[model samples]
Target: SMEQVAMELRLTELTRLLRSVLDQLQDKDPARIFAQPVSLKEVPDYLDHIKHPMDFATMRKRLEAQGYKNLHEFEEDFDLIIDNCMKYNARDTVFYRAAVRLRDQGGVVLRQARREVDSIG
Candidate 1:
């Protein structure tokens, strides 16, 4: 699942979609990529307009499919859910992180893709 080729392809698509949406944004806050906090009641409307309903389901299913069988499973962790939330609605957060990381790292991520992306993959 951590295949380099596949990851690259997915990132390519992700980057394209991000740019497309940002390019077309008409909001006064061009720096903002997210809507305000969403209420559970908005799920239906979100589903109705989702690019691929399966995309939403896949991310959750991936999370659910894990067994959490590790000995420390019950220790408690917010990272997974937070990761999924950020992954699903990441334009507002993840890309900003990517840019910040890039800026701070001085092209290091691109300089050695495998090394930088290994843990991340």
Candidate 2:
């Protein structure tokens, strides 16, 4: 019973931290493009260029499903969202610039999470 309770508590804390990270990213995105999956019809060649597409909605779904084993796994998906945007859009485009900004903002949030983790440890 005690072990199960401990595991549940850990899961709750992890989920809270993960959700906070997602929320910050969603809030910071100026275009809110990362909020949902890219429409293939709107960007016909999107899938042709980016093989692995990631979005905040998908990440939230994964979070709800407990798909992420840990924070590193969550970070991978976060990076994927930015990487896909950078890859699909040209250097001079608004999408590329937004992705760069999101990446920088993400770094700040992630570092804060790491600090919280270290403090707890």
Candidate 3:
């Protein structure tokens, strides 16, 4: 019914997006692992690593608000299966890895923490 439709819709979108990410990778896989914690500083570096960049900015923000420390943490929150596509055999992909790296090192915490902080008079 409605819930099933919603779930399928969500899953379809996820697979579509993940497939986009997967498409840019090594073009192969043998049961991969896509969930892993990436640091803030690591995200920026990943921008250069992907076939695309400048994506996942807003998603990163909401993820921070939800208290996810890293992209891996964000995935863990939804228990989302990130498309690993050959397990980073060639380092990583465009969309998914770039998105994940956005959470690493200095991605979410610094900005979110400032929002939580008070330097008010």
Displacement of the residue 66 alpha carbon in candidate 2, Å: 2.3
lDDT of 2: 0.86
Tens-place lDDT digits, model 2, residues 22-111: 898788896897888999889898888999999999999999876776788998999999999898889999888999999998898988
Local error of candidate 2 at residue 44 (angstroms): 3.2
lDDT of 2 at 12: 76
Best by lDDT: 2
Q: In candidate 1, what are the lDDT values of residues 1-109, reduced to their tens digit?
A: 6697886665654444333322232132233322232333866565444332322223323334442222123111222222334445556676446434333443332
Better of 2 and 3 by TM-score: 2
**Which window of ten consecutive residues has the lowest lDDT sum in model 1?**
70-79
TM-score of each: 0.22, 0.89, 0.25
Between prediction 1 and prediction 3, the one with superior lDDT is 3
lDDT of the candidates, in the order given: 0.36, 0.86, 0.37
Q: Note the clash tally of each candidate.
A: 0, 0, 9
